Amino acid sequence: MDVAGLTDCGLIRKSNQDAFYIDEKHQRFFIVADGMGGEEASRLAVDHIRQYLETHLEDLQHDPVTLLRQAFLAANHAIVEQQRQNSARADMGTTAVVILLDEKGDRAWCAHVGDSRIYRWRKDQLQQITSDHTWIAQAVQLGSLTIEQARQHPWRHVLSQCLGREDLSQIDIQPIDLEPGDRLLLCSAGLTEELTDDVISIYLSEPNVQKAAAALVDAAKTHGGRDNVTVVVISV
Ligand SMILES: [Ca+2]
Numbered sequence: 002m003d004v005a006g007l008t009d010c011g012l013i014r015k016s017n018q019d020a021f022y023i024d025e026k027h028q029r030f031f032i033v034a035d036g037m038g039g040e041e042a043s044r045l046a047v048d049h050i051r052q053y054l055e056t057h058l059e060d061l062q063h064d065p066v067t068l069l070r071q072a073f074l075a076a077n078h079a080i081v082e083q084q085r086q087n088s089a090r091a092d093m094g095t096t097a098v099v100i101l102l103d104e105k106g107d108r109a110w111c112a113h114v115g116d117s118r119i120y121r122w123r124k125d126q127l128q129q130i131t132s133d134h135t136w137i138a139q140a141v142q143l144g145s146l147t148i149e150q151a152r153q154h155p156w157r158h159v160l161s162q163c164l165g166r167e168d169l170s171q172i173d174i175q176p177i178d179l180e181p182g183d184r185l186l187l188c189s190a191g192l193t194e195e196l197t198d199d200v201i202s203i204y205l206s207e208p209n210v211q212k213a214a215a216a217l218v219d220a221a222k223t224h225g226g227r228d229n230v231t232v233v234v235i236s237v
């Protein structure tokens with residue numbers, strides 16, 4: 002498999018509070034986080050999830066749901082501890098999206114908290130796997146609010162879940178089976194606020210994943226680059 006990752010401050014923001022990690026050694030897991038002390042929070046999330054998976058993958062890869070829940074909870078606690086040991090950054094928080102591949106490499110466990118996304122691409126069609134933890138997306142799902150005005154709503158990106166909360170309740174985890182030639186995309190909402198799914202799907206069709214990742218970021222900036230933007234692209 003091939004993988005590429007890229008983060009960019011974008012054209013407007015003063016600093017980049019997104020972070021990411023790719024397991025380049027063994028290609029087992031991939032992480033993107035979007036902070037909001039947001040830089041501390043996203044860095045804690047990425048580091049703690051990485052270290053937890055590195056440590057427990059061997060023992061727990063047979064129970065990926067428990068492994069992922071425990072990794073996310075470790076990150077959550079680390080952020081909450083720093084909130085307590087820090088009045089200034091008392092409300093710091095971050096999203097996270099994680100893919101953990103099984104040993105064989107043709108199943109991706111997708112885990113997330115927040116409005117960063119995982120997508121799967123296949124033969125020029127793109128599917129969003131994760132459902133945003135936003136008050137707005139919850140409306141579209143269970144009630145009155147179309148994707149039409151939801152994508153236009155001003156509270157579009159207010160989070161209903163984030164890492165860094167004592168009362169973290171929801172960690173969404175689901176498996177997806179993979180076929181050769183599939184692409185997986187982990188991204189912060191800096192990408193999807195600028196690029197429609199149709200546009201994203203085109204850049205993902207670029208055979209070279211390093212080129213696809215760079216093109217996605219460049220495209221997000223050419224479209225306005227209003228926020229930090231991070232992508233990880235995996236070719237199966
Ligand atoms: Ca942010």
Ligand SMILES: [Ca+2]
Binds near residue numbers: 035158190191
């Ligand atoms: Ca954001």
Ligand SMILES: [Mg+2]
Binds near residue numbers: 179180181
């Ligand atoms: Mg097959």
Ligand SMILES: [Mg+2]
Binds near residue numbers: 194195224225226
């Ligand atoms: Mg724009």
